[PDB]
Amino acid sequence: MFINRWLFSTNHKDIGTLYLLFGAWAGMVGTALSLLIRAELGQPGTLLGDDQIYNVVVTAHAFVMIFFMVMPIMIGGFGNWLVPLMIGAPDMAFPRMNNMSFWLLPPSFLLLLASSMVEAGAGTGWTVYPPLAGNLAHAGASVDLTIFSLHLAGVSSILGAINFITTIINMKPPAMSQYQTPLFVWSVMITAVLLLLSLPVLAAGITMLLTDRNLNTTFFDPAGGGDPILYQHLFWFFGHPEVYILILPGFGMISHIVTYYSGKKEPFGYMGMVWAMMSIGFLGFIVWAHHMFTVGMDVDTRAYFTSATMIIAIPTGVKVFSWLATLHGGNIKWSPAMMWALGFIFLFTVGGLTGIVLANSSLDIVLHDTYYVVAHFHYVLSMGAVFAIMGGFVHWFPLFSGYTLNDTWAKIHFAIMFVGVNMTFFPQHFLGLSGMPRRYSDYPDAYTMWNTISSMGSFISLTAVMLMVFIIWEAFASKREVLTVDLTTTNLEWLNGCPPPYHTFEEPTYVNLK
Amino acid sequence: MAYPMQLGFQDATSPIMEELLHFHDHTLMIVFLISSLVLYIISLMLTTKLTHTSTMDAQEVETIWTILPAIILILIALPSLRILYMMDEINNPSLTVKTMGHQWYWSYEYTDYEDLSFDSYMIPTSELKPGELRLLEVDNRVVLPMEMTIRMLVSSEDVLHSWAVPSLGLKTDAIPGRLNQTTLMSSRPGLYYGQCSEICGSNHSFMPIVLELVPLKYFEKWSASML
Amino acid sequence: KIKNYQTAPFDSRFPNQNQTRNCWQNYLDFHRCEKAMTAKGGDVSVCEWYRRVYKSLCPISWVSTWDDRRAEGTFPGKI
Amino acid sequence: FENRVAEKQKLFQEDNGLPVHLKGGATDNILYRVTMTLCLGGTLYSLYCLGWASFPHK
Amino acid sequence: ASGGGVPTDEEQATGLEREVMLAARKGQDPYNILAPKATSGTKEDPNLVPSITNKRIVGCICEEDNSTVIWFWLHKGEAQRCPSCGTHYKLVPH
Amino acid sequence: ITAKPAKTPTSPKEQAIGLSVTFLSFLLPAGWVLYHLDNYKKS
Amino acid sequence: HYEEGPGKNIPFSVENKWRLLAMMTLFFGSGFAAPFFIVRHQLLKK
Amino acid sequence: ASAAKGDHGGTGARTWRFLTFGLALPSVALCTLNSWLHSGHRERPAFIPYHHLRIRTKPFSWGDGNHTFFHNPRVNPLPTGYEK
Amino acid sequence: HQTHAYHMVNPSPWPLTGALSALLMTSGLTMWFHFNSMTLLMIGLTTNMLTMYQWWRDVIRESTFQGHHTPAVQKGLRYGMILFIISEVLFFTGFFWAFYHSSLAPTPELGGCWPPTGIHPLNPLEVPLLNTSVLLASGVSITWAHHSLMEGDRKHMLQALFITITLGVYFTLLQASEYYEAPFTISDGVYGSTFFVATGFHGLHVIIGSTFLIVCFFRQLKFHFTSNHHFGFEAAAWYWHFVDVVWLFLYVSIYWWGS
Ligand SMILES: CCCCCCCCCCCCCCCCCC(=O)OCC(COC(=O)CCCCCCCCCCCCCCCCC)OC(=O)CCCCCCCCCCCCCCCCC
Ligand code: HEA
Ligand SMILES: CCCCC/C=C\C/C=C\C/C=C\C/C=C\CCCC(=O)O[C@H](COC(=O)CCCCCCCCCCCCCCCCC)COP(=O)(O)OCCN
Ligand SMILES: CCCCCC/C=C\CCCCCCCCCC(=O)O[C@H](COC(=O)CCCCCCCCCCCCCCC)COP(=O)(O)OC[C@@H](O)CO
Ligand SMILES: CCCCCC/C=C\CCCCCCCCCC(=O)O[C@H](COC(=O)CCCCCCCCCCCCCCC)COP(=O)(O)OC[C@@H](O)CO
Ligand SMILES: CCCCCCCCCCO[C@@H]1O[C@H](CO)[C@@H](O[C@H]2O[C@H](CO)[C@@H](O)[C@H](O)[C@H]2O)[C@H](O)[C@H]1O
Ligand SMILES: C[C@H](CCC(=O)O)[C@H]1CC[C@H]2[C@@H]3[C@H](O)C[C@@H]4C[C@H](O)CC[C@]4(C)[C@H]3C[C@H](O)[C@]12C
Ligand SMILES: C[C@H](CCC(=O)O)[C@H]1CC[C@H]2[C@@H]3[C@H](O)C[C@@H]4C[C@H](O)CC[C@]4(C)[C@H]3C[C@H](O)[C@]12C
Ligand code: CUA
Ligand SMILES: [Cu+2]
Ligand SMILES: [Mg+2]
Ligand code: NA
Ligand code: NA
Ligand SMILES: [Zn+2]
């Protein structure tokens, strides 16, 4: 029964639990990698004494955080747990294919581990640009294992996207239109359309890299008439959609959390929030070359990409102001989840605004490939995704587990984390403006003070992660079983109790049309 | 070069870099304002016992918060694009210099008249003369005439690199098989520093760029002294 | 003998950041011209402009590789 | 050929508690064990190969 | 030849597919494929909510085009009202 | 949210144990590797 | 059929909080330790 | 944009069989003829060791490492030229 | 029990064996490319084929034999197959992008022209045109099969599907012969790279599609399909039209425009 239940699952909740477990474990790996990065930079000189290893650590840090921590937690974990419950469905459309999306990830992760253990690792950047990632500058198996790791993660998410789109379109109650489905369900649907369209292009691109490295193709090799910049276009045609994939389920959870702890039955401006997510998803496909403003493109192309990129601020701002307008007039419950969501709104806004700075290709000449970009995305992506994830975990942990957290401990954990991430990343703006490149194992002496402070910040967030583990233990250790939650009339996922039975909605909800 | 505890951009050495500084001041003011308004409004929403939990109508307020961001974006984009098109307009240089990236050093070619070329390596920390800068000096600097429009052509003989000099507002990727152009104009004599800006392997952190800007007559003497 | 040559001027055929084709075209132009001028009545001095431009713009290793391949019979452009 | 679908419908609807991947009878079990043995053995072999490839081989 | 030899659903559908097909013939919806049409929802004319058991979750879209659905368990016994719009619902077991 | 009283309450002493054990499980292995970095770099 | 309810819908036991603490410590500690040991492995390789 | 054919009234199997045998398979027959007229081998061209062709940055994982997967000795020269 | 129409699937080992097969194939390719051995790759290919066979066998058991494919379940499978085909279109789009990027801006290494110096393309009016007529014809014949099935005509469904499969096999053998006769190779710069990777992935999809049609052929022989319920046949036809449309784009782009 253990193997049948946990290895042969066809249950959306159990598969969601596997994803949350996997993502949490990956989060520990990616955190350890981030601390090694900051240890190398925490004083001038060399710590590891091997900058190829440093580059391998940076590369792995990013792949682990994006592909094994954020997307499995948001889409595989919260998506599988919550989406069928929020639409009253009895499971996902393809419950058995769903289990394969999960089980592809431990092999994917194993292939990434293998990449770093054989030869000298893939010290390429998570972008894996040729020719550095080609078979002369990265000879041997490491880059190919990385490519295969990405193929398996890609198949996992493409099939998961097929599952979520089908579920959400096809398995709502017959009376419920798409404009009666909760915003988190919208956010997953749109994220899934972005994955469906973007990951195959990445797959095409890394497959061409594979064949340049092993079958004597020259897609990216000028000696055969190829072009390194073609790889960049294919990569970023996937990679800009990817960053919106990483935040969109977060936007969906934030809408639910802010609504809930403002004591509201609904988010402010629902159709605007749907519009804004669809607009961000659409614009997210026509901006990718803002990752390429220094490669030598024509001025009119740089002008188009500057302009198109900035337009995304308009729908994003509608969502930010609408969250504020949801708080407006609320009976505010200062829960730990609410704290995470409030920190999200502010830190995501800061990060989005430095993204608008970078959108200006003239200024990006001086800021590209510097710590200003690192600061931008650790605000908007790293803090953005982590705070939405923490807010969602604290809010829904009692649903998934049946047990309550200690709220005081959870607030302490929030406080430590908020200090730690801001001490870590805010000084990196100064390092970027003053010209410190990213992807460096050591820096000119002038940059010492802010690197020292940033590394000290990284340890504070380590203390938070450790505390988070203790807090989860304490909840399972004390076994305070949930009785009731408020606002179930507008939060259907709670209405089958905590945790819900293995099968829910065997008798579907009754919704009439009138 | 950067200096300890620096918060902003290196001092501008070229007119285009001055333009960027003014454009950044303009944009950062907007960033500060919007960030601070969001923070304020969060605190405003959270500091009253008054409530209103029934459905709120959204249409009117959404005109404001699409039109006003649209106007702000236009006020960023107009100076942004003006500077973009300035950088691109015809500058008619008096000198072309090529630089080729390698793992891990730069080489330079001055082939307008004489066929001069040479390699430029970081000085190891153990060899720095007293008072010289760790990770930044090179053995052979890029001698150039000040107050003159110079065409730099950038490429690579192996992996990607990127040739950058922050105080001149310059960063151009060095791509094998491709010859990227940028223009360089220093308002001042002196030494101007930069660092490889596209990850290129083991020693990415250790292949810096040093320009040495001098009056034309001294540039010519130096050129002349190379034959 | 019109010279006063300093460096290659702006060429409206090649107005963007990628200058590869400008180097390539003048390299071809010079060598096509220098071949033509081995007919009866020709001197390579007429080819000088292309020569100065490609020497100014082209990386030395590109010129050297192209020269080597012209001598091997493996140059892929038409001269 | 004749239409024998009804007899397969009777077989696969028999209330014997078997999951669908084993409900055809003893051949299903054989094919399953072959498959799983190859998968788990290959996975063990792949881990062996990682170990081998993780260290320089002289 | 333009002949035959392809089974029909009536001949060969089985299991739940066949139950759905047969119920559709009789105009019944035991598997909840259709959205029910509301009554006036008064106390005298409550919406009648079938269930195989003694409680079922109702979602109430109180006005046409509301995006917010109001969810609650409806129990056997006296009709209950939507906590948002007050329309009445009465469970009819099975 | 409302909840039944803890089935198996975790005293402050019990918490101090779980916290210390948790923190040690992160810190000791990483500490061992980092302490011995120079023993690695010289091999 | 499977067990349901708090502490029964998970692939690890919470019957004993100290056994749990060992499990969680091995679980999260193994993931956190792994990058330090891979770095060690690469530094030691040659 | 519908060719010069023209036969509906309630589409069906009979019409699509008519297209299959009356248009589609005749087209295949005609292209098969066309093709099995212009078949026969062309003069293979002088070998020139162009550096953008016969690329070898890593040996192939079969044979001697220097032959492509569907190598045809009559028309595929190696980096050093045609085979004996 | 349930009173919805959706399918609660029995716990299954095939997701796990499929995921492990993926680990074995990719680590197997790595070992082939770098450590001169096909062992892991052969195990992975074998377990992948075993996984697909048993998984789709079980889907047949669940639907033809157990009745779980209600109209709602079928509707879900229609969406799933359309979405899968869309993802496959985007995969090919990446290869077309690479082709147009290289061919619209030929670099000096090529001769600054397209086709590159030294490349002698196939004549698109010879076997490539025949292949085009073959796949177009099989789109007509599979539509005849579809209508015959809907009209209850077993014999003509089987004839038309047989013709469709025969044309798919003919395409594959023609393409195998053209690969062998081609005077250029995958190592012939970006021309060979784009040609063989793009037509090669397409050829793989022709083999996949043909195999899917063969599965349908045998299921039809065994009377699995009704005149109204036959989604495996509809999915294989959709997939087959997708393979035909990709070919037309390849023919116009790489063979004809690129020659
Ligand atoms: C929670 C705490 C954790 C601890 C870690 C730190 C957290 C961050 C809090 C820190 C509290 C932040 C208050 C504004 C910071 C601006 C500092 C500055 O002087 O910046 C200067 C400029 C460049 O300026 C120059 O070229 C000239 C510099 C010198 C000016 C002349 C005076 C000479 C002396 C200067 C003395 C200092 C001046 C400062 C003047 C101070 C004015 C406020 O650099 C930059 O652009 C860097 C900007 C990065 C872009 C992000 C902007 C959005 C942030 C708005 C809310 C803060 C979020 C904080 C993140 C969250 C904070 C809550
Ligand atoms: C969660 C992930 C995430 C998100 C959501 C974003 C959002 C944005 N990003 Fe960022 N980005 C990354 C993750 C993300 N980014 C990553 C990982 C990289 C680097 C990859 C690498 O190189 O490794 C990166 C890199 C990156 C670059 C390339 C920089 C370079 O390498 O030189 C650029 C350039 O334009 C950019 C711009 C933006 C913009 C304009 C947004 C916008 O969508 C932000 C819109 C939000 C706001 C503007 C705030 C809220 C709005 C209001 C309150 C309204 C009023 C505001 C105005 C009128 C301005 N990003
Ligand atoms: C007959 C019609 C065509 C049918 C298909 C033929 C075989 C293709 C098999 C799979 C095709 C998919 C990969 C395409 C990779 C390259 C193969 C290109 C097609 C082909 O077969 O190309 C041949 C070379 O094959 C070679 O290198 C060897 C190829 C064998 C090793 C391939 C290893 C790479 C596989 C990578 C898979 C990545 C998949 C990722 C999917 C991710 C999804 C998200 C061409 O032979 P040639 O002798 O060079 O020139 C002929 C001269 N007379
Ligand atoms: C470099 C080498 C890389 C190698 C990577 C290898 C990766 C994976 C190993 C794959 C093994 C596949 C095993 C067969 C999977 C069959 C899935 C399937 O057919 O899923 C179906 C749903 O997907 C649908 O329809 C529509 C979708 C059908 C998907 C079929 C499988 C495709 C797997 C590869 C996809 C790649 C993406 C391509 C685009 C880039 C059925 O869903 P179930 O939940 O099962 O059942 C529901 C029941 O009601 C049925 O009665
Ligand atoms: C030489 C061998 C080479 C091997 C490599 C891959 C090989 C071959 C794979 C060929 C695909 C075969 C798929 C067979 C699926 C059979 C199961 C099936 O068709 O199942 C049908 C459901 O469809 C469904 O799940 C639809 C299921 C969708 C299947 C989609 C398959 C596409 C697979 C692509 C995989 C590779 C991707 C590309 C790589 C780059 C069952 O429903 P019905 O038909 O209505 O029947 C019910 C009636 O009888 C009731 O009266
Ligand atoms: C980036 C995250 C890292 C966070 C920093 C970790 C904080 C410190 C945790 C403690 O780590 C321990 O430190 C000891 C030193 O205090 C080491 O003992 C070492 O040093 C001792 C004293 O010299 C000897 O007795 C031991 O045998 C010798 O192994 C021991 O190995 C190590 O586990
Ligand atoms: C028409 C549509 C849906 C309305 C509904 O059926 O409920 C609504 C939803 C969100 C609205 C948009 C958003 O509110 C954002 C923009 C707000 C401006 O005031 C008008 C244009 C604007 C782009 C809106 C146009 C239109 O009213 C939208 C698109
Ligand atoms: C045996 C079967 C009879 C139909 C039925 O069983 O009622 C018949 C009907 C159609 C026949 C098939 C179709 O005519 C198509 C093919 C015709 C080829 O000449 C032989 C094989 C071929 C595939 C036939 C095999 C067999 O004779 C089939 C399959
Ligand atoms: Cu050269 Cu980085
Ligand atoms: Cu982007
Ligand atoms: Mg760069
Ligand atoms: Na360092
Ligand atoms: Na049909
Ligand atoms: Zn109501």
**Residue C17: closest C-alpha in chain B:** B181
Cβ-Cβ contacts under 8 Å for C67 (sequence gap 6 or more): none
Which chain H residues have a beta carbon less than 8 Å from that of I186?
Answer: 68-69
Q: Does I109 touch chain C (CB under 8 A)?
A: yes
> Could you give the angle at which helices D26-53 and I39-60 cross, rounded to 10 degrees?
150
Check: CB of residue A362 under 8 Å from CB of residue B87: yes
Give the whole-angstrom CA distance, residue A288 versus residue A282.
12
Check: CB of residue H52 under 8 Å from CB of residue I116: yes
Give the whole-angstrom CA distance, residue A333 versus residue A344.
16
For tokens 């006036």, what's the residue?
E40
What is the bridge-based pairing of β-strands E55-60 and E70-75?
antiparallel
- Give the distance from residue A45's alpha carbon to the nearest chain I alpha carbon, in angstroms: 36
For tokens 């200024």, what's the residue?
A363
| Ligand 8, CB cutoff 6 Å, lining residues | D 1; E 5; I 154-155, 158-159, 162
In this structure, what token pair is assigned to residue A379?
């605000």
For the stretch A338-363, what's the b/e string if a residue is b when 16 or more beta carbons lie within 10 angstroms of its beta carbon?
bbbbbbbbbbbbbbbbbbbbbbbbbb
Of B52, B75, B91, which closes a domain? B91
Give the whole-angstrom CA distance, residue A472 versus residue A478.
10
With the C-alpha atoms ordered A298, A302, A303, A305, is the resulting torsion angle positive or negative? Answer: positive
Helix, strand or coil, per DSSP, at residue A501: coil
With the C-alpha atoms ordered B47, B49, B53, B56, is the resulting torsion angle positive or negative? Answer: negative
Q: List E75's β-bridge partners, or say none.
A: E55
Give the whole-angstrom CA distance, residue B140 versus residue B123.
10
Number of domains in chain A: 1
Q: What are the helix and strand counts (H, E) for chain F?
A: 2, 0
Report yes or no on chains E and G touching (3+ CB pairs under 8 A). no
Give the whole-angstrom CA distance, residue A260 versus residue A262.
5
Check: CB of residue D23 under 8 Å from CB of residue D11: yes
Alpha helices in H1-84 (DSSP H): 13-19, 25-35
CA I104-I171-I162 angle, 5° bins:
145
DSSP chain I: ---S----PPP-SHHHHHHHHHHHHHHHHHHHHHHS--HHHHHHHHHHHHHHHHHHHHHHIIIIIT----HHHHHHHHHHHHHHHHHHHHHHHHHHHHHHHHHHS--GGGTSSSSPTT--PPPTTSHHHHHHHHHHHHHHHHHHHHHHHHTTBHHHHHHHHHHHHHHHHHHHHHHHHHHHH-SS-TTSHHHHHHHHHHHHHHHHHHHHHHHHHHHHHHHHHTT---SS--HHHHHHHHHHHHHHHHHHHHIIIIIIIT-
Domain that holds residue B137: 92-227
Helix, strand or coil, per DSSP, at residue B89: coil
Give the whole-angstrom CA distance, residue I141 versus residue I244.
12
Give the whole-angstrom CA distance, residue A378 versus residue A428.
10
Which atom from ligand 2 is nearest to the alpha carbon of A309? 40
Domain that holds residue A483: 2-514
The candidate with the shortest Cα–Cα distance to A47, out of H4, G15, F34, I256, is F34
Q: Does D3 touch chain G (CB under 8 A)?
A: no
Tell me how far CA of residue B13 lies from CA of A279, A368, B9, B21, B212, in angstroms. Answer: 41, 19, 11, 11, 12
**A128 dihedral zone (left: phi>0; alpha: psi -120 to 50; beta):** left
Please report, for chain H, the start and end positions of each structural domain, with discontinuous segments joined by +. Answer: 1-84
Question: Before B79, cis peptide (omega within 30)?
Answer: no
Which chain I residues have a beta carbon less than 8 Å from that of E30?
Answer: 3
Give the whole-angstrom CA distance, residue F24 versus residue A129.
39
Please report, for chain G, the start and end positions of each structural domain, with discontinuous segments joined by +. Answer: 1-46
Q: Does A492 touch chain E (CB under 8 A)?
A: yes
The candidate with the shortest Cα–Cα distance to A302, out of A364, A390, A259, is A364
With the C-alpha atoms ordered A150, A153, A159, A160, is the resulting torsion angle positive or negative? Answer: negative
Tally of CA atoms within 13 A in the half-sphere of D25 that contains its CB:
2
In this structure, what token pair is assigned to residue A472?
């989860």
Tell me how far the alpha carbon of residue H22 is from its chain's centroid. Answer: 25
Helix, strand or coil, per DSSP, at residue B143: strand
Tell me how far the alpha carbon of residue B138 is from its chain's centroid. Answer: 19
Chains near I (3 or more Cβ pairs under 8 Å): A, C, D, E, H
In this structure, what token pair is assigned to residue C67?
């020269």
Give the whole-angstrom CA distance, residue B32 versus residue B38.
10
Give the whole-angstrom CA distance, residue B58 versus residue B61.
6
| Ligand 2, CB cutoff 6 Å, lining residues | A 243-244, 246-247, 290-291, 309, 312-313, 316-317, 320, 349, 352-353, 355-356, 358-359, 364, 367-368, 373, 376-377, 380-381, 384; B 34, 38, 69, 72-73
Which chain D residues have a beta carbon less than 8 Å from that of G45?
Answer: 55-56
DSSP A107-136: HHHHHHHHHHHSTT---STTTT-TTTTSTT
Give the whole-angstrom CA distance, residue A335 versus residue A263.
12
Alpha helices in A383-511 (DSSP H): 384-401, 407-433, 448-478
Helix, strand or coil, per DSSP, at residue B117: strand
What is the bridge-based pairing of β-strands B180-184 and B150-156?
antiparallel
Tell me how far CA of residue B61 lies from CA of A330, B14, B47, B56, H49, in angstroms. Answer: 18, 45, 21, 10, 70
Give the whole-angstrom CA distance, residue E75 versus residue A501.
19
Give the whole-angstrom CA distance, residue A133 versus residue A119.
14
Check: CB of residue A510 under 8 Å from CB of residue E58: yes
Closest in A229, A331, A435 to B51, CB measured = A331
In this structure, what token pair is assigned to residue A308?
């198109």
Q: Does C6 touch chain H (CB under 8 A)?
A: no
Tally of CA atoms within 13 A in the half-sphere of I244 that contains its CB:
20
> Could you give the angle at which helices A141-170 and A105-117 cross, rounded to 10 degrees?
160
Helix, strand or coil, per DSSP, at residue B210: strand
Give the whole-angstrom CA distance, residue A246 versus residue A387.
12
Residues in chain E: 94
With the C-alpha atoms ordered A261, B50, A268, A317, is the resulting torsion angle positive or negative? Answer: negative
Q: Does C41 touch chain H (CB under 8 A)?
A: no
Give the whole-angstrom CA distance, residue A116 versus residue A481.
43
Check: CB of residue A347 under 8 Å from CB of residue A375: no
> Nearest 5°: phi and psi at A226?
-85, -175
Question: Before A182, cis peptide (omega within 30)?
Answer: no
For the stretch A5-23, what's the b/e string if a residue is b when 16 or more beta carbons lie within 10 angstroms of its beta carbon?
bbbbbbbbbbbbbbbbbbb
Check: CB of residue A459 under 8 Å from CB of residue A372: no
Give the whole-angstrom CA distance, residue I205 versus residue I201.
6
Question: Before H62, cis peptide (omega within 30)?
Answer: no
Amino acid at B218: Y
The candidate with the shortest Cα–Cα distance to B197, out of A136, A57, A371, is A371
Check: CB of residue I87 under 8 Å from CB of residue A156: no
* Nearest ligand to the CA atom of F35: 6
> Nearest 5°: phi and psi at B150?
-115, 135
Which atom from ligand 9 is nearest to the alpha carbon of B101? 1
- Where are the strands (E) in chain B, listed by range? 95-102, 105-110, 116-120, 142-145, 150-156, 161-165, 170-174, 180-184, 190-194, 209-214
For tokens 């004749």, what's the residue?
D2
- Give the distance from residue G9's alpha carbon to the nearest chain D alpha carbon, in angstroms: 21
> Nearest 5°: phi and psi at B170?
-110, 135
Give the whole-angstrom CA distance, residue A82 versus residue A507.
18
Amino acid at B124: P
Q: List E93's β-bridge partners, or say none.
A: E51
What secondary structure letter does DSSP report for G16?
Answer: S
Please tell me what resolution, in angstroms, this structure has: 1.7
Cβ-Cβ contacts under 8 Å for E2 (sequence gap 6 or more): H13, H14, I151, I153, I156
User: Is E60 a known ligand-binding residue?
Assistant: yes
Q: How many CB atoms lie within 10 A of CB B89?
A: 8
SS3 content of chain A, % helix, strand, coil (to 5): 70, 0, 25
Helix, strand or coil, per DSSP, at residue B209: strand
Check: CB of residue A93 under 8 Å from CB of residue I76: yes
The candidate with the shortest Cα–Cα distance to A228, out of B180, D6, C38, is B180
Please report, for chain E, the start and end positions of each structural domain, with discontinuous segments joined by +. Answer: 1-94
> Nearest 5°: phi and psi at D44?
-55, -45
Amino acid at A36: L
Q: How many CB atoms lie within 10 A of CB G29?
A: 21
Amino acid at B147: E
For the stretch A275-296, what's the b/e string if a residue is b when 16 or more beta carbons lie within 10 angstroms of its beta carbon?
ebbebbbebbeebbbbbbbbbb
Q: List B155's β-bridge partners, or say none.
A: B100
What secondary structure letter does DSSP report for A499?
Answer: S
- Provide the greatest CA pair distance for chain C: 40
3-class secondary structure for I94-142? Answer: HHHHHHHHHHHCCCHHHCCCCCCCCCCCCCCCCHHHHHHHHHHHHHHHH
Check: CB of residue A179 under 8 Å from CB of residue A113: no
Name the burial class of residue B184, with classes exposed (0-12), middle (13-18) and buried (19+) by CB atoms within 10 angstroms of its CB: buried
Give the whole-angstrom CA distance, residue E37 versus residue E49.
11
> Could you give the angle at which helices A313-327 and B15-45 cross, rounded to 10 degrees?
20
The candidate with the shortest Cα–Cα distance to A358, out of A301, A430, A319, A309, is A309
Which chain A residues have a beta carbon less than 8 Å from that of G31?
Answer: 25-29, 32
Name the burial class of residue C15, with classes exposed (0-12), middle (13-18) and buried (19+) by CB atoms within 10 angstroms of its CB: middle
- Give the distance from residue A111's alpha carbon to the nearest chain D alpha carbon, in angstroms: 9
CB proximity under 8 Å: A 433-472 to G: 469, 472
The candidate with the shortest Cα–Cα distance to A153, out of A90, A218, A238, is A238
Of B91, B126, B145, which closes a domain? B91
Give the whole-angstrom CA distance, residue E71 versus residue D35.
46
Helix, strand or coil, per DSSP, at residue A262: coil
The candidate with the shortest Cα–Cα distance to G25, out of F34, A391, F27, is F27
Tell me how far CA of residue E30 lies from CA of A172, E24, I104, in angstroms. Answer: 17, 9, 61
Q: Does B9 touch chain A (CB under 8 A)?
A: yes
CB proximity under 8 Å: A 211-230 to G: none
Give the whole-angstrom CA distance, residue F23 versus residue F19.
6
Please report, for chain C, the start and end positions of each structural domain, with discontinuous segments joined by +. Answer: 1-79
CATH number reported for the structural domain that contains residue A180 in this entry: 1.20.210.10
- B97 and B202: one domain? yes
How was this structure determined? It was done by: X-ray
Amino acid at F37: L
Q: List E89's β-bridge partners, or say none.
A: E47, E80
Amino acid at A402: G
Which residues of A carry out catalysis? Answer: 61, 91, 126, 156-157, 240, 242, 244, 255, 290-291, 316, 319, 438
Helix, strand or coil, per DSSP, at residue B155: strand
- Give the distance from residue G43's alpha carbon to the nearest chain A alpha carbon, in angstroms: 8
Cβ-Cβ contacts under 8 Å for D16 (sequence gap 6 or more): D23
I133/H53 touch (CB, cutoff 8 Å), yes or no: no
The candidate with the shortest Cα–Cα distance to A458, out of A434, A422, A430, is A422
**Residue C22: closest C-alpha in chain I:** I108
Helix, strand or coil, per DSSP, at residue A23: helix
